[PDB]
Amino acid sequence: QISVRGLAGVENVTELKKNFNRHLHFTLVKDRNVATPRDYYFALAHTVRDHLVGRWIRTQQHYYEKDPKRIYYLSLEFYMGRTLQNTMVNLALENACDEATYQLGLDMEELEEIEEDAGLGNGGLGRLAACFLDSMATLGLAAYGYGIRYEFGIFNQKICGGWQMEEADDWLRYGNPWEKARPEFTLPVHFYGRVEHTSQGAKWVDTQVVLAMPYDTPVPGYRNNVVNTMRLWSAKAPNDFNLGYIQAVLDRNLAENISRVLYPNDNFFEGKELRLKQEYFVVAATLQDIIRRFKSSTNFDAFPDKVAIQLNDTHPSLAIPELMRVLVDLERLDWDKAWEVTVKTCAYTNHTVLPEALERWPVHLLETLLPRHLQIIYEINQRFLNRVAAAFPGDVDRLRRMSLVEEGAVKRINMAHLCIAGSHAVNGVARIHSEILKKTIFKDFYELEPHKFQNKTNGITPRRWLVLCNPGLAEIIAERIGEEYISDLDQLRKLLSYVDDEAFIRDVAKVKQENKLKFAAYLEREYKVHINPNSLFDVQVKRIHEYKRQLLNCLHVITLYNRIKKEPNKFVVPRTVMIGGKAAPGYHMAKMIIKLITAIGDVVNHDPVVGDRLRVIFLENYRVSLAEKVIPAADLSEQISTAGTEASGTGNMKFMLNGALTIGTMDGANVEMAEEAGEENFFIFGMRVEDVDRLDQRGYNAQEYYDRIPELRQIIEQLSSGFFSPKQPDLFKDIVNMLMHHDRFKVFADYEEYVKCQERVSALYKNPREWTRMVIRNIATSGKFSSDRTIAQYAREIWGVEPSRQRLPA
């Protein structure tokens, strides 16, 4: 059908059909007469999986023979989404599978919709890990992702009476055809116990044992025949565990709970014992696997030449003391040699500066759960502080600030400080964020060891986020500049020579229009809701958080509503305002924001004077598969965090690649996006980081904005008096009180500039030709935001390995 989806050769189509029928009969044990669409999805998934297998075996064989440096990417989260289509794209099988299924009387698009998301992350951090795995495979790196196979991923969100309800995401109910259990490589993980000191060093004894069973998932590179591995650990009780009899067997659940559920917090630290168990579980199993692989090739001097460990935030930070434990207690290396090896092996990526997101574990938890690790942490701290004292003699306050051990009512370990001490490289995830790290929270560490600190601006994979989700746009691009851009996204710059080409302008606008119609129909079918597809699609999708300022968007929506009601017979550019995202279950204010958004919709969408000039839709259950649908349909991307708070963002980049314009603050990667595209092709507004700092020094007083801006006062009076909640007039008083008296994110301070900037958006949308030309300028300069670029930088500047675009033999 379309070129970028590959060839549908007669031999290949015939073979796919044979194998589909083979799997339906033998694997699924169904005949066509009772097969459901789910059976057909599974038969197709098994058919496509068979094509991965040979490449997977050959790739892993190739690494055993060549013995390259291995990259281990450790994360508590891998937000993978669906696998079927991505696998077909990466193996060039999409058109052949389409044809094969078409000839069997089936619609492949319908079958794709049956697959569950692998929702093993919360948002951006977990999705970054997934994009990175795709880029590492595409760049031929001998890379392994290591994590936890949660039985329950991020909860499914239902909206009932305008409120978020949570349901368990039982993603494994029907089976997962992509994984392979490897019960043969099961490893023990120790907890509790105590330390005894012999003449032959320390011994960690009387421990409870939980088994870590690995499940392997293939990670195909883009058309290079490389298939890497994502290894996820599941918790199993040993068979003598607790061994009246019946109760002992039922109590195996206590051990197996470690891998049961993903903690559903985004940018928030919850210091619970179960979470600490999860962190150690992943680290201890992974490190044993790493060392096993290293020994199958005494001399740990070469360990950093053969192994890189990348810590995805501090969540796997126990890798540092665990590596020391193994090297010192088990392999009998002297402390200094072990520390040298550890530092050269480990690197740390920071993803946030919000204080409530930083992991600070109570000493009493570590003392009970991991007594040997606590001793090792204390020794690291004493040796580290001795270096600080030698470099900055007499600076006693610096010793207190830099300590791994925080004093207070409860003594805590600062895991970020541990990661900096024990890593040869520390990076932020966008230029402004990496600068903030050096100037504020890690300033002291930067002064001691400036060479450690780097930037690696985030990216997204153009396979999933262009080719897979927006084939129409991929194709019209490919017609002009060929297919090479899919693995070399900088080639999109060539599109700048088509900015005045009438046919290209028309095609870009046509693809957007098609995507909007398709999404408007999706909404009607699955959610009984009717939207005008000629309206500007104004989209804010991301987790619900005060710092992301969904509330600022709400204030603009109410402003538009009030302006319409004031002058109903004036023309306004029609908008469909779509907001979606999950709130963490314990985050009360985030749950109230969801309720406000639905309550605004309840008023706006049923006011006959508004008509179809303004609609407000809350998009339920925002997740990777919904992102793939809504992002290609968007006109305007809302990226409106308070300057200094969004470390990078990656949704921002997805929208840029897919032909939306951006309204945003100079925060995270928005700064670099604006720089690449030109500030004239971006809708920038609001306080810069420096302006936020100036306000904080003077003191933020929200009342000043309320007193000076009549349109804002009207909105607050509407919220307070029960206009958006007639039956419960005080329902939103917590929101009003926060905005007026303890708003950490200065919503009112950016309100006037935001509304004015939104008026400029509407003015440009009225001139479709100029809107579309600006879009071309954004798509054309989005190349920097490929995760292939990001990963090549990690590879060269941190891991010390050279990427490769060369194909393994088929």
Which residue ranges are tagged as binding site for AMP? 31, 64, 292-297
Helix axes 124-138, 787-794, angle to 10 degrees: 80
Known catalytic membership, residue 650: yes
Record the tokens describing residue 155, joined without a space.
């909860």
Q: Give me 472's structure tokens.
A: 């129409």
Binding partner of 721, given ligand B1N, ligand IMP, a second copy, none, CB within 5-8 angstroms per partner class: none
Distance CA 75, CA 351 (A): 12
Choice among 463, 543, 623, 746 that is catalytic: 543
Q: Which is nearer to ligand IMP, 394 or 809 (CB)?
A: 809
- The kind and range of the H/E element at 306 are helix 303-306
- Which positions ≥6 away from 586 have C-beta within 8 Å? 265, 270
| Residue 85 binding target from ligand PLP, ligand B1N, a second copy, none, CB below 5 to 8 Å by type | none
CA atoms lying within 13 Å on the CB side of residue 115: 27
* 263-292 residues near ligand B1N, rule: CB under 6 A: 265-267
Residue 236 in tokens: 């199993």
Backbone torsions φ then ψ of 536, nearest 5 degrees: -70, 125
CA atoms of 214 and 417, how far apart (whole Å): 31
Rule CB under 8 A: say whether 591 interacts with a second copy. no
Which own/partner contact pairs does 436-440 have at CB distance under 8 Å and 24+ positions apart? 436/353, 436/644, 436/689, 437/350, 437/353, 440/353
- Site residues for ligand IMP, 27-86, by CB under 6 A, read 33-34, 60-61, 64
Residues closing a segment before a gap in the chain (C–N exceeding 2.5 Å): 243, 297
Options 471, 659, 668, 803; binder of ligand B1N; rule CB under 6 A = 668
Each residue 646-665 as x (binds a second copy by CB under 8 A) or -, in order, gives: --------------------
Using N-to-C axis directions, what is the helix angle for 733-741 and 710-721, rounded to 10°? 150
Q: What's the Cα-to-Cα distance from 383 to each of 302, 376, 377, 798, rounded to whole Å?
A: 24, 11, 10, 25
- # residues near ligand PLP by CB under 6 A: 12
Draw the binding track, 112-131, toward ligand PLP (x: CB under 6 A; -: no contact): -----------xx--x----
Residues 607-626 that bind ligand PLP (CB under 6 A): 622-624
Least distance CB 347 / ligand PLP (angstroms): 23
Which DSSP letter does residue 465 get? I
Report the amino acid identity of residue 595.
Answer: K
**Burial environment of residue 337 by CB neighbours within 10 A (0 to 12, 13 to 18, 19 or more):** middle
Spot the catalytic one: 650, 665, 772, 781.
650
Task: Rule CB under 6 A: say whether 193 interacts with ligand B1N.
Answer: no
Judged by CB under 6 A, the residue of 52, 80, 100, 128 near ligand B1N is: 128
The secondary structure of residue 582, as a DSSP letter, is: P
Cβ 229 to ligand IMP, closest distance in Å?
A: 8
586: enclosing H helix or E strand: none
Contact 594/618 with Cβ under 8 angstroms?
Answer: yes
Q: Are 48 and 97 in contact (CB under 8 A)?
A: yes
Nearest-approach distance from CB 571 to ligand B1N, in angstroms: 38
Q: What is the DSSP track for 433-459?
A: HHHHHHHTTTHHHHHH-GGGEEE----
Return the SS3 of 39. helix
Strand partners, 219: 228
Is 543 an annotated catalytic residue?
yes
Catalytic residue check, 548: yes
Tell me the window of 473-481, 601-609, 649-657, 725-733 that interacts with ligand PLP (CB under 6 A). Answer: 649-657
| CA distance readout (Å), 567 to 49, 513, 574, 610, 612 | 59, 30, 15, 11, 16
Candidate list 86, 101, 138, 156; residue touching a second copy; CB under 8 A? 156
Binding residues: 31, 64, 292-297
* Residue 352 contacts ligand B1N per CB under 6 A: yes
Among 10, 105, 161, 175, binds a second copy (CB under 8 A): 175
HSE-CB of 761 using CA atoms within 13 angstroms: 26
- To a second copy, the closest distance from the beta carbon of 36 in angstroms equals 7
Helix (H, G, I), strand (E, B) or coil at 75: coil
Residue 131 near residue 459 (C-beta atoms within 8 A): yes
For position 469 contacting ligand PLP by CB under 6 A, the verdict is no
Identify which of residues 39 and 788 has a Cβ nearer to a second copy in the complex. Answer: 39
- Of the residues 55, 231, 315, 548, only one is catalytic, namely 548
- Residue 494: name its binding partner from ligand PLP, ligand IMP, a second copy, none (Cβ under 5 to 8 Å by kind): none
Binds 265: which of a second copy, ligand PLP, ligand B1N, none (CB < 5-8 Å by kind): ligand B1N
* Residue 624 contacts which entry, ligand B1N, a second copy, ligand PLP, none (Cβ below 5-8 A, type-dependent): ligand PLP
Question: For the packed helices 84-91 and 94-103, what is the interaxial angle rounded to 10 degrees?
Answer: 120
* Distances in whole angstroms, Cα of residue 382 to Cα of each of 385, 402, 422, 727: 5, 11, 13, 61
* Catalytic residue, candidates 23, 70, 351, 615: 351
> Quick one: the chain helix, strand, coil %, rounded to 5?
55, 15, 30
Among 277, 315, 542, 613, binds ligand PLP (CB under 6 A): 542
Which of a second copy, ligand IMP, ligand B1N, none lies near 122, with the C-beta cut-off 5 to 8 A by kind? Answer: ligand B1N
Contact criterion met (CB below 8 Å) for 582 and 155? yes
> Interface with ligand IMP includes 297 (CB under 6 A)?
no
H helical segments located in 139-257: 245-250, 253-256
Query: DSSP 3-state assignment of 394?
Result: coil
State the number of binding residues for ligand B1N (CB under 6 A).
Answer: 18
Catalytic residue check, 351: yes
Give which of ligand IMP, ligand B1N, ligand PLP, none residue 471 binds (C-beta under 5 to 8 Å, depending on kind).
Answer: none
In the complex, the residues that contact a second copy under the rule CB under 8 A are: 25-26, 29-31, 36, 38, 50, 53-54, 56-57, 61, 152, 155-156, 165-168, 170, 173-175, 180-181, 183-184, 236-237, 239-241, 243-246, 249-250, 252-253, 257, 260-261, 263-264, 272, 274, 585-586
Binding footprint of ligand B1N on the chain (CB under 6 A): 122, 124-125, 128, 265-267, 351-352, 357, 429, 458, 646-650, 668
Active centre residues (catalytic): 351, 542-543, 548, 650, 654
What residues make contact with ligand IMP under the rule CB under 6 A?
A: 33-34, 60-61, 64, 293, 296
Q: Which residues bind ligand PLP (CB under 6 A)?
A: 123-124, 127, 542, 622-624, 627, 649-651, 654
